[PDB]
Structure 1
Amino acid sequence: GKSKKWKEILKFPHISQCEDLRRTIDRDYCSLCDKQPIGRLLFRQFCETRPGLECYIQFLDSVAEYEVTPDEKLGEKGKEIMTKYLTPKSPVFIAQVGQDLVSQTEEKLLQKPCKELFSACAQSVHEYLRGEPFHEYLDSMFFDRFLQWKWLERQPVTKNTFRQYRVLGKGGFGEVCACQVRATGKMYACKRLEKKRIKKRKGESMALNEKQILEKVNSQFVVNLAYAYETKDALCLVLTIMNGGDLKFHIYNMGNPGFEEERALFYAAEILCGLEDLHRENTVYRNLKPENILLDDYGHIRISDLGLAVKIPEGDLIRGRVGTVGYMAPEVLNNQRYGLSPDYWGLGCLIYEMIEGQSPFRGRKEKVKREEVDRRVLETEEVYSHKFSEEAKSICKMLLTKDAKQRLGCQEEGAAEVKRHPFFRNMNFKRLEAGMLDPPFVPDPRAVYCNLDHTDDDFYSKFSTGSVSIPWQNEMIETECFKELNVFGPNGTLPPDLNRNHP
């Protein structure tokens, strides 16, 4: 549902408008050719024009396929790649990998195969492309086209950039609408925060905390921020739409109550991956509870309410009794100084609650005061049932270890430790992060699973930043706007917008 004249808004500017962008963008290979989706596509598109570079992109694709191939099917795939790219007389032969590297991978395949068999080769390939091909691409018409896409990216966004549809989560410190970008037709979730409440409550710093935490992290398993802007009356945050409901509804209304262990495994694996992505930014979530794990249209999950998240300074600890009764780690209830450990306590709480259909320290049918709930969280040892395997019992106990120093995942190894736990013994995290494992429950599409101060001016100047690069470029690609507008000249000739001769 793109706007009538959607091609005029995303109309490329003339290459001459991007000179300021050219002399300012950092020419980091990893950033321009990999992280940034549209940049990645354009560099790959540049490599298709050269004969000697095409085989390198094809090989990296085949390695990407190898990493997610099942175990029983690895050998075959490995041999395929070898006889295709790594044989001297192959039409698509990789040259910059040393002969002493192809013979090393020959020895590797002569034995049991591994998922990272081709990692050495792929790194050699990238070390090559990082040099001569990359700098060739910089002086190519495709980097020029990238500068055009960036110029579009940084354009100002306002209320007119989107169109609102319905309110969905009116309740918190604001409301959550269903905004939609008009030029592309992509659906999001407006997160209107009323300026007046913000100043009255004096929590402007927490608005920036959530906005900046979101803009920095980009995970498949945490709601992604795509736009932040200021409108008369409020400050909305354009976020990933989640039309599948939340985990609380599916545990209790659509559950036994509860899930089978295998189902809980899927959700816990994605949640652990979300928490790992947040922790890579030394950011603790502190608000893990079923109603904050949402489902999308496919059945995959994302962490949602980041209003309590904070970026723990590296080599530092923080203080704060925050969260929801019954989902607060003991170190928090006591107001001790903690790190990332509350999130792993929350993970324990969630796996338990999914499997058993009730909280580990409170019964669905129980009527207890916050005081006794906290006393149990701090003193009582939880009990398990035949719904848990020994492995599930184990991971829940280790994650629900009262002493954050003994708690699983709260060591130097981090999420890796939790991912190795026998509870995930049958989980291929690689295929999970690649979206290959089918989710257990698929939400039906047509379902309903339910003043004039200058100080505020600076607070907004830091909040209303605009579009987020990676999300924005991803939006362009999903809506096929990139496919449609990314059109060069007939038979590899400079299009008019990229030829400095005629503006």
Structure 2
Amino acid sequence: SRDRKYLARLKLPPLSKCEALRESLDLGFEGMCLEQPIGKRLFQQFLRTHEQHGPALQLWKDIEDYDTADDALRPQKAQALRAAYLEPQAQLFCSFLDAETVARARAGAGDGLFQPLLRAVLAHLGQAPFQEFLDSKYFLRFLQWKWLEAQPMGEDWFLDFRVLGRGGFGEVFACQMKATGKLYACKKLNKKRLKKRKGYQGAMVEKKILAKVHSRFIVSLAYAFETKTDLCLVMTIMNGGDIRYHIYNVDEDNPGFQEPRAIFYTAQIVSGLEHLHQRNIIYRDLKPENVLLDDDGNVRISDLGLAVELKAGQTKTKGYAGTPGFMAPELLLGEEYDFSVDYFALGVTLYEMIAARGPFRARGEKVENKELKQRVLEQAVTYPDKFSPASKDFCEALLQKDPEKRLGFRDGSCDGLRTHPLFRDISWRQLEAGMLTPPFVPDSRTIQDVGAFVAFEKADTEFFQEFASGTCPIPWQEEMIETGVFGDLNVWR
């Protein structure tokens, strides 16, 4: 189940020890009470047991419920919400709202009703209620948790029990957090090998990006430490492995996906792309081999070592990186580029899910890289009849050789791409919240042995200590909640 010796080191400290922390933390409302899972829970208990804020809590909860409920149910839920909180003679009536918002909220509909009302409620909650919360026993308890979150939790706390895969710098293991029982993947990078092959920069960029981005469509970093021989990244476990295995290696006679399945994965990859592009990051390594699948049947993107973060007032970059057959014409030509290259590789990826072969070579054909580059620059793609009219069109709109014409990310978003007929039966709102059932669930399917193969300077040592930054806060708080430890220790008397 879990190790009693490591479970017994999760205990709340006496308050005296939490003094210093006050200075080191952001005590802003958005950052503490909305973005940190344990902060939100505690804030919500305060609002629940101080009953004058009761009307504001239940309106908050009923908006989130409306936002993620499915189409047929929404019309009735809107009517309920209006009546409960927005009629003057109602019991849970929200006086604190201003006359305009109150008025505007009681009329019409749309794909985002009550988004202005949700801002008005958070705006209110950030003033008096928040101020009183800081004077309460619940804020003090927040500090106890943030202290425990900061204690050292390195190599000794994880048990490796099986090999999941092999990368360029070492193995990736399935492992267990000893105190809570939770399962993760741990990717190992050999230090001596990283040095001789000049891979520091690629390793650091991947770790920086996986720490700061928080999306259900990209693998999440929970811990980063060092051992005497390796650097380690502990991250979301994806037990189904890569999407490419599933195209070719399961049904040999009849490879490829049915169309509804191919569309669903396409929609999840677009959301992850969007979360990268909103932060000015270019991925540069999208392919079936790097899209992974979990026990429930959802996917995420991985392998971020080829990525580039655009600096202040830079809109394009140069550089020859990627996998032949996935690199767009503008890149092959030596031009400057932006997000365009990611949307071409998305075209190649959908094509292969449906057809079980690439658009520029027959299945099991052998082509030297120089010939494959000429094909991408000049060849028209042909489409066999496994494609519908909609999926043919969508692929043509991404594989388009002129990036000025290609569909993708513009004016802050992928909302133009989302309206394509291909997606007509997909509920974007529900997909983004994690509440569609995937139309395939992983059935019965769950590594050959090989052997293994200069002192360091302070430059190397100091680089290793900077890489090994410790525990990421949002994922740690989730672990504590999911596994039941929050429930057992968050008690008073």
Using the size of structure 2 for normalisation, the TM-score is: 0.94
Indicate the SS of the match to 1:302. strand
Looking at structure 2, the residues matched to 404 and 143 of structure 1 have their Cα atoms a distance apart, in angstroms, of: 51
Looking at structure 2, the residues matched to 272 and 432 of structure 1 have their Cα atoms a distance apart, in angstroms, of: 11
The superposition leaves residues 134-170 of structure 1 with CA deviations (integer Å, 9 ceiling, x where unpaired) of 1211222111111111111122221112111122212
The answer on whether the counterparts of 2:182 and 2:483 sit within 8 Å (CA) in structure 1 is yes
The answer on whether the counterparts of 1:249 and 1:449 sit within 8 Å (CA) in structure 2 is no
Indicate the residue corresponding to 1:120 in structure 2: 116
The superposition leaves residues 330-377 of structure 1 with CA deviations (integer Å, 9 ceiling, x where unpaired) of 222233221111111111111111122211112214232222222121
| RMSD across aligned positions (CA) | 1.8
Looking at structure 2, the residues matched to 148 and 237 of structure 1 have their Cα atoms a distance apart, in angstroms, of: 26
The answer on whether the counterparts of 2:6 and 2:157 sit within 8 Å (CA) in structure 1 is no
Indicate the residue corresponding to 1:336 in structure 2: 335
Q: 1:426 is matched by which residue type in structure 2? A: D
Q: 2:261 is matched by which residue type in structure 1? A: R
Match of 1:448 among 446, 449, 461: 446
Indicate the residue corresponding to 1:315 in structure 2: 313
Indicate the residue corresponding to 2:262 in structure 1: 264
| Structure 1 residue runs without a partner (length 5+) | 490-503
Alignment: residue pair count: 484
Looking at structure 2, the residues matched to 336 and 476 of structure 1 have their Cα atoms a distance apart, in angstroms, of: 48
Using the size of structure 1 for normalisation, the TM-score is: 0.92
Indicate the SS of the match to 2:34. helix
State the identity as a percent: 48
Indicate the residue corresponding to 2:75 in structure 1: 75
Match of 1:464 among 440, 461, 468: 468
Looking at structure 1, the residues matched to 485 and 165 of structure 2 have their Cα atoms a distance apart, in angstroms, of: 30
Match of 2:248 among 227, 252, 256: 252
Within a 5 Å distance, the mapping from 1:321-400 to structure 2 comes to 321-400=320-399
Looking at structure 1, the residues matched to 105 and 480 of structure 2 have their Cα atoms a distance apart, in angstroms, of: 39
Looking at structure 2, the residues matched to 144 and 6 of structure 1 have their Cα atoms a distance apart, in angstroms, of: 25
Q: 1:273 is matched by which residue type in structure 2? A: S
Within a 5 Å distance, the mapping from 1:203-282 to structure 2 comes to 203-254=199-250, 256-282=254-280
| Structure 2 residue runs without a partner (length 5+) | 449-454
Between 1:288-297 and 1:394-403, the stretch displaced more is 394-403
Indicate the SS of the match to 1:72. helix
* 1:165 paired to 2:122: no
Looking at structure 2, the residues matched to 249 and 170 of structure 1 have their Cα atoms a distance apart, in angstroms, of: 15
Indicate the residue corresponding to 1:305 in structure 2: 303
Indicate the residue corresponding to 2:289 in structure 1: 291
Indicate the SS of the match to 1:167. strand
Looking at structure 1, the residues matched to 359 and 409 of structure 2 have their Cα atoms a distance apart, in angstroms, of: 20
Looking at structure 2, the residues matched to 352 and 191 of structure 1 have their Cα atoms a distance apart, in angstroms, of: 30
Indicate the residue corresponding to 2:23 in structure 1: 23
Looking at structure 2, the residues matched to 442 and 273 of structure 1 have their Cα atoms a distance apart, in angstroms, of: 21
Indicate the residue corresponding to 2:451 in structure 1: none
Indicate the SS of the match to 2:61. helix
Between 1:62-71 and 1:410-419, the stretch displaced more is 410-419
Give the ranges of 4+ consecutive aligned residues of structure 1 lying more than 4 Å apart after TM superposition.
Answer: none
- Gap change, CA 1:262 and 1:449, over 3 Å in 2: farther
The superposition leaves residues 407-438 of structure 1 with CA deviations (integer Å, 9 ceiling, x where unpaired) of 11143344222222222222111100111111
* 1:98 paired to 2:131: no
Looking at structure 2, the residues matched to 15 and 403 of structure 1 have their Cα atoms a distance apart, in angstroms, of: 62
Indicate the SS of the match to 1:407. coil
